[PDB]
């Protein structure tokens, strides 16, 4: 269904945040189970920000380490560049 | 320059996986529409770091920036017929389709790999399926019919992912003849609701059956697709509809 992150600091976004996915992603953790290239949608709320940026990803990486979620790969589209961007400036601050 | 202690914690992560376990291999049913029906799957990698699974989408960005692509093709093709040689054990004649890359076209231990292993494990070529998308494929010609020759000499089939896209498409099936081509998703994802898509559907499969030239789609997720690509006589249909991706090959084709 519905997945949401809200990252409200730095850090929180720096742990979240995978930079070396192809195009970007970012962990989102969840109790529901998905597999890989499955679709997701997620609502993600960045740090210093409230709107919340819609993200049509898809999953990259599942873990059941740390945290017990699913990895979102942006779109390529400029909707999800922009949102890789975003946090790309958010964290060299 | 933190994170680029960071980098290599994951490329000696690949490295070992390259050499030992931690890659596998997961499997999705390829589907005979029109009915021949055969055992026939798409293998997808993947790489087990306790219990975490990840897809190429996290980590084939870094192994691009260390040459790293070709060996990991090797490993999924190499896998992939051990996989055919513990599948004819069991008494299945299952074929198995294998995405790999351009550079591939040049690896020598490509095709020395691919000879080695269908030999040991016992596997006739036509039970390989190599592809590799229009895009690259037309970047890199020389080099692909080099491969092409070199792999169809082991009966083995060669096809396009990727397929449909531009107009240069046909222009490249004039210098390149592969077993099959693979629609892409632009195409086939709504030609369930559209003009532009079936119309030229109809066309490539009316243009591609004579030549012998198998014509696939991807990324099926409803019955009206189905019945469109049917009636439209595409010869394979994979996906979420048809059949889901796992790492057991147990789907009852017929
Ligand atoms: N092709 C295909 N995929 C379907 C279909 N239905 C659902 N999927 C899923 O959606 C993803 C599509 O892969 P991609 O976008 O072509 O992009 C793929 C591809 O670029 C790459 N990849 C996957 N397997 C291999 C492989 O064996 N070798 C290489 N070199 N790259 C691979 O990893 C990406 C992620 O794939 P996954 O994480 O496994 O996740 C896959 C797959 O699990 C379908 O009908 N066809
Ligand atoms: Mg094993």
Same mark, same amino acid.
């Given at each position: ?12 976004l720096?742990s ?5 996915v ?38 990259i ?7 017990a979620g ?24 | ?19 030992g ?6 499997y999705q ?11 026939? %799957? ?33 490993w ?11 599948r004819?054990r ?13 550079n591939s ?15 040991? %494990?016992?596997?006739?070529?036509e039970?390989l ?14 080099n692909?019919?080099?491969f092409?020759?070199?792999?169809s ?16 498409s ?6 390149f003849?592969?077993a099959f ?8 994802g709504?030609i ?23 014509t ?11 019945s469109?690509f049917?009636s439209?006589?595409?010869?394979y ?5 048809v ?12």
């Open positions: 269904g519905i997945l949401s992150l809200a990252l409200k600091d730095k850090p929180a720096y979240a945040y995978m930079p070396f192809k195009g970007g992603g970012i962990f989102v953790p969840t109790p529901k189970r998905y597999m890989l290239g499955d679709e997701v949608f997620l609502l993600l709320t960045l740090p210093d920000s409230s709107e919340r940026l819609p993200v049509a990803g898809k999953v990486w599942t873990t059941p380490n740390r945290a699913i990895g979102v790969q942006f779109p390529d589209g400029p909707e999800g560049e922009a949102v890789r961007n975003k946090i790309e400036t958010l964290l060299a601050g | 320059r933190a994170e680029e202690e960071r980098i290599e914690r994951w490329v000696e992560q690949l490295r070992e996986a390259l050499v376990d931690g890659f596998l291999l997961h049913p390829v589907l005979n529409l029109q009915g021949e029906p055969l055992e026939l %799957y798409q293998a997808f990698l993947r790489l087990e770091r306790n219990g975490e699974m990840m897809s190429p989408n996290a980590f084939m960005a870094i192994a691009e920036e260390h040459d790293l692509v070709t060996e990991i093709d090797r999924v093709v190499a896998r992939a017929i051990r996989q055919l040689g513990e004819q069991a008494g299945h004649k299952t074929h198995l389709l294998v995405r790999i890359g351009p076209f040049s690896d020598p231990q490509m095709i020395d790999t691919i000879r080695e292993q269908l030999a040991v %494990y016992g596997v006739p070529g039970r399926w190599l592809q590799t998308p229009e895009s690259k494929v037309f970047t890199h010609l020389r692909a019919q080099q092409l020759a070199a792999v000499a082991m009966d083995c089939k060669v096809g396009l992912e990727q397929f449909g896209s531009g107009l240069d046909f222009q490249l099936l004039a210098h003849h592969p081509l693979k629609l892409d998703r632009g195409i086939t709504d369930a609701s559209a003009r532009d898509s079936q119309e030229k559907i109809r066309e490539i499969t009316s243009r591609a059956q004579p030549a012998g030239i198998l696939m789609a991807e990324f099926v997720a409803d019955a009206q697709s189905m469109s049917f439209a006589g595409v010869d249909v994979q996906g979420d509809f059949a889901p991706t796992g790492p057991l090959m147990n789907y009852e084709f017929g």
